[model samples]
Target: KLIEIRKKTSEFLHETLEESNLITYNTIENAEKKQKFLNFFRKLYSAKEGKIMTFQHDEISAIAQMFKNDSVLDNLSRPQLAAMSKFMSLRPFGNDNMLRYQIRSKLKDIMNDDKTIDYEGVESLSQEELYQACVSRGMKAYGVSKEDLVDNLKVWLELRLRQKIPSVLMVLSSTFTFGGLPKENYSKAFSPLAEKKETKSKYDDLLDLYYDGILQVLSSIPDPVYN
Candidate 1:
């Protein structure tokens, strides 16, 4: 599973790199004029590699700790280390998990800091207003604009869906392996169920849902993009 995920991630990154290269070539004419794009490319490449290295380090540490083997480090070749670094860097468990963890931590910090929460207009706020509140809270902690928060959140949600939908479908499809059930009946069985349980504020619930969804998505994508 890890190997397959790594292969798919590499393919995705390669496609993105190719597209970026094409854009750079077509958008810029002179060699000197394209320096910025070249620099951008180099920066992105470095970031990608750095993220991979971080992930690899974490994985190696985890494995070594789990197996109680201090000599696991000695078993790795330079090339193998590099490959593990690169692969682990981009894998969902590495950078994605770290960023989402950071976001959750930041959000918890903001929640704990009452001054950071904007309580004004809470009684009759629109979805946009709630979004802005989240943006404001994020911006206060991260020094990014509301627009950047929104954009980043959107990207995170998309990545989350990409990672989750497959697992969801897999679970749904597994029921079909049994030859006894009708297709429509199985479909109904697989559909998401609604709960009638009461909760706190709908606004708060919505915000929490949105935040969690975005975090989950962000956790699924390559960490270099978020960083």
Candidate 2:
């Protein structure tokens, strides 16, 4: 299952890389230039290879050392790492139980952090990385160039917070919803039986739109997902 996830993930990244037309513009200009970059960043990290490249996340410094995005600002570093982060973090692959549960698992990790999540490389993400990050946060799904994403992301995030819709959400499971949301809305995601028993409902169609948003996010890069 893990191997299949890895294979599916690689296919997704390959498609994204091609869609970016970056390899041709950046790499096809000099194929060796591409290989030169890939040699360092593209290989899989083997815990067996060494301790330095692996984890010892017991302290802040140890945690910080685990992520090192810097490299010579040539054809080698930025693009490859951008490509890697998008493929791995977003997991743009099959939405089977394994994949869905993986997303749930990642979201579980996210639950531990407040808006104060820490990272140094936000400014360093390549065009592809920024694009996927924007998609993850549910900004406009279409019609924007890579160059304009950051400003738009700022506008969207601020606009959302400014709305003052004071509520919290934590999806403990596909059906287990929690937070300060109203019971009526909570029943929609968690207690569907009660939702129907109570009142006229848009909840039935709500999940369809929820799923459609996922599909839209996947389709944002422009490809027939199953084709």
Candidate 3:
């Protein structure tokens, strides 16, 4: 099902690009134009990926905050989100045996509702385990000990973000650069560069805020397996 969905999405994107004349041999004729397209694609992909991480952060925060009154597990913290994001960005490799064990332990604790689990169990696990179990079946499932939950979530999120970003960016670029939006309103007509400055400034501000928060969160996670 996932494969089919991706195949269909790619086909749709190719069709849309063709219709919009955004991905053509002539469109990418010049070095400058090619570079613009490259930057445009990266910005588009990164923004969407950041948004997904934001949503996950918000969801986890809400859940953690809800349980703040509980003496055991307090709500999720900024550090946790940062750790998760950093781990996601690493693109790790290996069998991840340690991650799998940690995930199982965390899962067991969550399912058992024993937040007071000893350091032996918790410390035995890695950051990847905590992240994955939290996002998935709450950390406890049998015969799933070898799995890295955080890595799994990262893979899933990256795949979806990759599919979404380019299409959306292309459409928005087309609208501003050549679409009827300019033609329809004569008074507001301006070259793409005229609008680029304001748009870039706004985007930069937003990106900086996000990175700051994420960096803070990342600092909080103890002994994170940085890639």
Candidate 4:
């Protein structure tokens, strides 16, 4: 009887500890940890390979609330709480809307820049406007180039808007864009760039545009600003 009581007590304590974590406000600063942590949750709930998972608002909202129960967040400092809420609100990968959710969210973040951009959709932006988006991503806005190295992420994404999914380049580039990779794909399979710090990579930037596949695929989309 006593052993059974102890077992029950231990189970109750274990359950209590997990419940406490929901209201706990511990934070992590290593950016990749959060990415991986969220990825784990995604794998838990998302369907297996190649299957599209349908999400309802209640599911997304419930997930958010599940992650950051209010009482725990309420005790955090203001900045801590706000950042916590943002991460909690962001949808995990594996769902169709997650990418758009991020782009729309990112759109608002970049609104004050010198360039004009929008993400209601990137497909309809004038070529000039598209060029502006490129520069905002870190190309030169005015001093142009046939040599400027950029990439095809947005073009592929834009192409998706147009219903073109058969391109070889689109298939490959999708490996690195927003919902990127084999997890063990080239970038991770090899040395990853120092994403921890933001520094200029002028040569690489130029090189980025110069990849034949990237260049050809992206170049297919003309810059609206004609010289």
Best-matching candidate per TM-score? 2
71-100: candidate 3 lDDT, tens digit per residue: 111222223222221222222223344333
Q: What Cα-based lDDT does every candidate model obtain? A: 0.30, 0.31, 0.29, 0.32
lDDT of 4 at 26: 33
Cα deviation of 206, candidate 3, in Å: 0.6
Q: Per-residue lDDT of 1-227 in model 1, one digit per residue for the tens?
A: 43353454434433332222111143344665455434433432443322431122122222112211112223323332233233333222334335334333443453443232223323344446445543323211134444544444332233223322221111112212222222121001110121233543443333333333222222222332222
- Lowest-sum lDDT 10-residue window in model 2: 166-175
Q: Give per-model TM-scores.
A: 0.19, 0.23, 0.16, 0.21
CA error at residue 206 for candidate 1, angstroms: 0.6
Q: How far is candidate 4 from the true structure (C-alpha RMSD, Å)?
A: 21.4
Q: In model 2, what lDDT does residue 109 have?
A: 45
Model 3 residue 68 CA deviation in Å: 24
Candidate numbers, best TM-score first, in rank order: 2, 4, 1, 3
Q: Per-residue lDDT tens digits of candidate 4, residues 1-227?
A: 32233233333322232223322223533556445445534533344445533332222222223233233333233333232223223323433334434434553444333122234444455566656555333223344442232232243333333323222222222212222111221110101352333863554343232232222222222221120
What stretches of model 4 exceed 4 Å from their correct place? Answer: 1-46, 49-53, 56-109, 114-125, 134-175, 178-180, 184-227
Clashes of 2: 0
